[model samples]
Target: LALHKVIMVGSGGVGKSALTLQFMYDEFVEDYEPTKADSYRKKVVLDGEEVQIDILDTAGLEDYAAIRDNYFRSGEGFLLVFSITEHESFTATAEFREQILRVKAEEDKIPLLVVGNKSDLEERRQVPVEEARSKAEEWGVQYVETSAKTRANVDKVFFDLMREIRTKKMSENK
Candidate 1:
């Protein structure tokens, strides 16, 4: 059971709907936002396969850049959140990763995850886990730290982006 469609860029309250409602069903609240056929599903485990995690319901718009460019045109995955005690929400994660790489016109590969949410406040951190791990290693992606009021690492940034988007669709179908 491997499936993924994740999305939840960042800005607004810098919670990204409270870290995708505390990583699905732990608890949080807001209103309609997720699209990709209105999402939010779950079943877990990764390296050991067995999965099905759909997380959408995105409404934390930065004044609507075409609603995050139509959520990066039907994204296969992403959870690019931010809020390490707000240093401009980690400097706006390069303008929301340049609007998901300009609505994903492509950037090597995708299936991103650059989270850093409230990290249990660490005395109100002002963004500097070595400069957000050097911008997630110059934006290749994968730098996590979460809290959502103490649900730390919030299920390892959605199970490490659902096993890195199920191993990036099995390495783009080899």
Candidate 2:
């Protein structure tokens, strides 16, 4: 079994843990506390194949920057999350991208999946899906809009990332 380690990064209150929980367990926690130096592990099936995935859902505050920075070096891939309802979360993408690039300098080709969560709340949608997709394209990464609350495209997010990683791994082996 191939082990994949993915780190989820975003600003505080952007629904990183919520999305992780919903994707990993298909359950949502209404009163979920913000992550505090905690990491969650789960196994997921992608395209009918089971694989072990270790997800580090790090805190989003600047104070926990060390937590993310420290783990950045070992992450195989990243899920850069942002809430469509929060504009500030969108602004942090560049800095987050830069941090990952710095840590994984030699592995710059590693997969980076940009996730824009909270698709169920159209009334409060702040970031346009097209904008997020375009930004992701510009960075040469994958993008998906999801809703952890409703499980909308949650599976798609993981599936897409896994597919990308698998494809890259296959090419590397060749």
Candidate 3:
């Protein structure tokens, strides 16, 4: 069975949980709930191959080392998310990436994507598109702007990550 473990890491209220709910189900929830950790397993067809994706939706505990370390350890890939409307949340992404990088081995090239959520609020944008793109480029990862409310690029981000995971797994097998 092909299963890829993906973790959602970001600051509080960055739409990490929102994106998960939208991708798992076609519904978008606006209520803000404090997530301890919500886990979901779904059967999906990635590039014509059926696979299971385990999404661990974590609480915004990036500053808490113990809990995050344990969660990060089991993750095969990650979505380092932040809100496009909030500059502070975008600034917080670097720390989250650093934590994940530290959790993985030095030789391990982690599968990761930098996601800027809340793209529906484009009029209220705080983080510039090129600025985020450049940062993702600097880290050698893809930068995607998404909207959980509008469901824009919701499936693309998850599917893209899964493809990266599958590619990495095939390389590992060979």
Candidate 4:
């Protein structure tokens, strides 16, 4: 089985932890906890092929900024998550993207997904959907919305990235 290393990057309280937990265990965590760094490994059947996925969760605040580049470099793909209820968090995605590109380099053609999480909280949404879409379009990456609470499109984001990672690996081996 192939192993794919995926990283979740975003600002604090954007629910990167929540989304990771939901995808890992199929449960939603109600309380917010500050994550410095954590990792999870899972066995999944992607397109009927067995594979292992390794997810490294990082802190959004300055707590782990010193070592974030190391984590970013280790990832085969990334899901840049931001909350729909927080515009500042959405804006932070740009800085995160720049950091990833700097560490991973543009020549590598890294697979990335610009993710808008917390989609179930439409009433509290502050970031406009089109704004996020426009940013994704500008980045030339796919955008997906997920709700950890409702489990909406939760698996799609992970599976889609894995497929992209697989494709990238195959092309490079040519």
Predicted structure with the largest TM-score when compared to the true one: 3
Q: How well is each residue in 1-174 modelled by candidate 1, as lDDT tens digits?
A: 767777777665576767777777676556546444667777876667677877775665676648557866676777777787777766765677767767767544677778777788788788777778776778777576777777666767777777765567468663
* Better candidate by lDDT, 2 or 4: 4
**Given candidate 2, what's the lDDT at residue 90?**
82
Scored by lDDT, model 1 comes in at 0.71
| Consecutive 10-residue window with the lowest summed lDDT within model 3 | 29-38
Runs in model 3 deviating more than 4 A are 30-38, 172-174
List model 3 lDDT by residue over 74-156, tens digit each: 77888888888888887777877777877887536678888888898879998888888998788777798888888869878
Model 2: per-residue lDDT, tens digit, 1-174? 668877777655587777777776688777665544566666767778888877777665466646557777767877788888889888876578878778777763677788888888888988888888888787787677788878878766666777778887456653
Question: What residue pairs are clashing in model 2?
Answer: none
Q: Candidate 3 lDDT (Cα, whole model)?
A: 0.80
Global fold similarity of model 1 (TM-score):
0.31
TM for candidate 2 is 0.85
**So what's the TM-score on candidate 3?**
0.89
Name model 1 segments beyond 4 Å from true.
Answer: 3-75, 101-116, 122-145, 148-153, 156-174
Candidate 4 TM-score to native: 0.87
Number of colliding residue pairs in model 3: 0
